[PDB]
Amino acid sequence: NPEFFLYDIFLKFCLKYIDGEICHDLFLLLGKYNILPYDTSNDSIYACTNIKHLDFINPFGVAAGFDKNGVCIDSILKLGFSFIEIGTITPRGQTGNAKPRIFRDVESRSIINSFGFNNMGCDKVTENLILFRKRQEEDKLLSKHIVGVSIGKNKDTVNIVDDLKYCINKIGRYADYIAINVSSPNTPGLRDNQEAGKLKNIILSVKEEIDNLEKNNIMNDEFLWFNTTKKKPLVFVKLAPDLNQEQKKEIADVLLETNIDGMIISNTTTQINDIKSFENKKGGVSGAKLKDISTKFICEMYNYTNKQIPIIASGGIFSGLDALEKIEAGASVCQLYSCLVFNGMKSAVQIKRELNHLLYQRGYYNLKEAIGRKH
Ligand SMILES: Cc1cc2nc3c(=O)[nH]c(=O)nc-3n(C[C@H](O)[C@H](O)[C@H](O)COP(=O)(O)O)c2cc1C
Ligand SMILES: Cc1cc(Nc2ccc3ccccc3c2)[n+]2[nH]c[nH+]c2n1
Ligand SMILES: O=C(O)c1cc(=O)[nH]c(=O)[nH]1
């Protein structure tokens, strides 16, 4: 397969010599120009999955922070992913923290970043997503692919809820689901919104603004929800792994009380302090070193919520084996980020095949039968 082969060489070269932020922006640009490879294969019917009435053609998507501004949605999806989470976006554009702000360690397959929500802002990203949605209805390869939107707050915003409401009113119509980001480590005081009291008020406000989209509209649903589901976006919350047991219990109760549609487990961590090349660096850590921590977090929340809240897995997923660990722990779907950095354009094709072979040799009829089996 020549196209993937050439890109693997170029990506390995880029890893060794070129700055990480430069690399990421380079490949986003190549995707914008539509010169990345395609995965046009039919996905196994036995690896499809869902979160409530939200259907995924396969269980692998791209996590938030990868295409922050929705400039590259088509090409990333056509690598073989069933969905992508754009953002995190904020109402106003931000430059983020000072460069350099992302570093990679190849041997440990780990990353550390201190971006601080650099993004073009809700208005510009909304225009980008609208353009995608128009392209989607004329491209055979984009049908049934899901696009979620991660939302957060500007660095100097004091009322997070005011920022979340603004983003929902601008972009909610074009999103299949909304991810509430209260777990970034690179914006001071954001994670404090995971406290049960603050979190509950945030979720209810978010759900209220989404419900208010449908009200005061004269068109049929088919023209209000310009997304993939043609329904109002589901609501997820992304949690950080840096919490004590009691905090995790209180959060679990809030999710059940508010009837949230799902939880993303998890964001980056600050606990990792054994990566030599990162010892002087600032930010949250991604990649392999995060896998075990995040998989445990999945098991815990699956228990604390009594299996009632669907889970989106994020953290150190590189192989089909890694994916099955997340699924057997309680996850319904998996998100990749670091895998794309170190494995390149073949990440989706490769990991989908590995998971299919593993579901068979493990004696599963389909993916859904494996959800939560470890417990
Ligand atoms: C450079 C970078 C930027 C990220 N930006 C976001 C973001 O904007 N919003 C978010 O919810 N998570 C963000 N993340 C976290 C990832 O979405 C993901 O949850 C985390 O990296 C763990 O996945 P992984 O181990 O497969 O990389 C970012 C991660 C990295 C490395
Ligand atoms: C070599 C490399 C790539 C990369 N980012 C990638 C990888 C894969 C992509 C596929 C499609 C579109 C954009 C992509 C961006 N990063 N990121 C942070 N360091 C780093 N190093
Ligand atoms: O924008 C960032 O710096 C960022 C956000 C986030 O949610 N997670 C992360 O690791 N970095």
Q: How far is the CA of 283 from the centre of ligand 3 (A)?
A: 8
b/e 185-219 (16+ beta carbons within 10 angstroms → b) = bbbeebbebbebeebbebbebbbebbeebeeeeee
Kindly give the number of the ligand 3 atom that is closest to the alpha carbon of 64. Answer: 7
Per the structure, the count of domains in the chain is: 1
Q: How far is the CA of 43 from the centre of ligand 3 (A)?
A: 31
Cβ partners under 8 Å of residue 77, min gap 6: 83, 84, 141, 142, 145
Three-state DSSP state, 361: helix
**What 3 state SS string does 177-205 have?**
EEEEECCCCCCCCCHHHHCHHHHHHHHHH
Catalytic residue, chosen from 75, 184, 266, 332, is 184
For ligand 2, say whether the CB of 73 is within 6 Å of any of its atoms.
Answer: no
Give the residue carrying structure tokens 């969905």.
83
Which of 259, 252, 263, 318 minimizes the C-alpha distance to 288?
Answer: 318
Active-site annotation holds for 75: no
Q: How far is the CA of 28 from the centre of ligand 2 (A)?
A: 7
Q: How far apart are CA 84 and CA 315, in angstroms?
A: 15
- What is the number of the ligand closest to the CA of 343? 2
Angle at 213 between CA 207 and CA 215, to 5 degrees: 110
CATH of the domain at 176: 3.20.20.70
Top mutation candidate among 186, 265, 271 for ligand 3, by most atoms within 8 Å of CB: 186
Phi, psi for residue 216 in degrees, rounded to 5: 65, 50
For residue 148, count CB atoms less than 10 angstroms from its CB and return exposed for 0-12, middle for 13-18, buried for 19 or more: buried
- DSSP sequence for 291-357: HHHHHHHHHHHHHHTTT-S-EEEESS--SHHHHHHHHHHT-SEEEESHHHHHHGGGHHHHHHHHHHH
Contact in structure between 88 and 184 (CB atoms under 8 Å): yes
For residue 269, count CB atoms less than 10 angstroms from its CB and return exposed for 0-12, middle for 13-18, buried for 19 or more: buried
Contact in structure between 286 and 111 (CB atoms under 8 Å): yes
Domain hosting residue 367, numbered range: 1-375
The closest residue, in CA terms, to atom 9 on ligand 2 is 27
The closest residue, in CA terms, to atom 19 on ligand 1 is 267
Top mutation candidate among 267, 272, 334 for ligand 1, by most atoms within 8 Å of CB: 267
Give the residue carrying structure tokens 């070129």.
18
Ligand 1 site residues, Cβ closer than 6 angstroms: 63-65, 68, 87-88, 102, 111, 113, 115, 150, 181, 184, 238, 267-268, 286-287, 290, 314-317, 336-339
- DSSP sequence for 207-229: HHHHHHHHSS--S-HHHH--SSS
For ligand 3, say whether the CB of 90 is within 6 Å of any of its atoms.
Answer: no
| Resolution value (Å, 1 decimal) | 2.1
The closest residue, in CA terms, to atom 7 on ligand 2 is 341
Dihedral angle at the C-alpha atoms of 102, 335, 91, 160, nearest 10 degrees? -90
Q: How far apart are CA 317 and CA 16, in angstroms?
A: 22
The closest residue, in CA terms, to atom 5 on ligand 3 is 184
Q: How far apart are CA 228 and CA 50, in angstroms?
A: 14
Q: How far apart are CA 35 and CA 85, in angstroms?
A: 21
Q: How far is the CA of 27 from the centre of ligand 2 (A)?
A: 6
Q: How far apart are CA 75 and CA 84, in angstroms?
A: 11
- What is the number of the ligand closest to the CA of 116? 3
Residue 304, both tokens: 């604390």
For residue 361, count CB atoms less than 10 angstroms from its CB and return exposed for 0-12, middle for 13-18, buried for 19 or more: exposed
Q: How far apart are CA 320 and CA 349, in angstroms?
A: 11
The closest residue, in CA terms, to atom 16 on ligand 2 is 24
Q: How far apart are CA 233 and CA 173, in angstroms?
A: 8
For ligand 3, say whether the CB of 75 is within 6 Å of any of its atoms.
Answer: no
- What is the number of the ligand closest to the CA of 112? 1
Contact in structure between 48 and 57 (CB atoms under 8 Å): yes
Which of 122, 17, 142 minimizes the C-alpha distance to 75?
Answer: 142
The closest residue, in CA terms, to atom 7 on ligand 1 is 65
- What is the number of the ligand closest to the CA of 338? 1
Residue 336, both tokens: 């990749």
What's the N-to-C CA distance of the chain in angstroms?
40
E strands, 69-152, are 83-89, 102-105, 110-113, 146-151
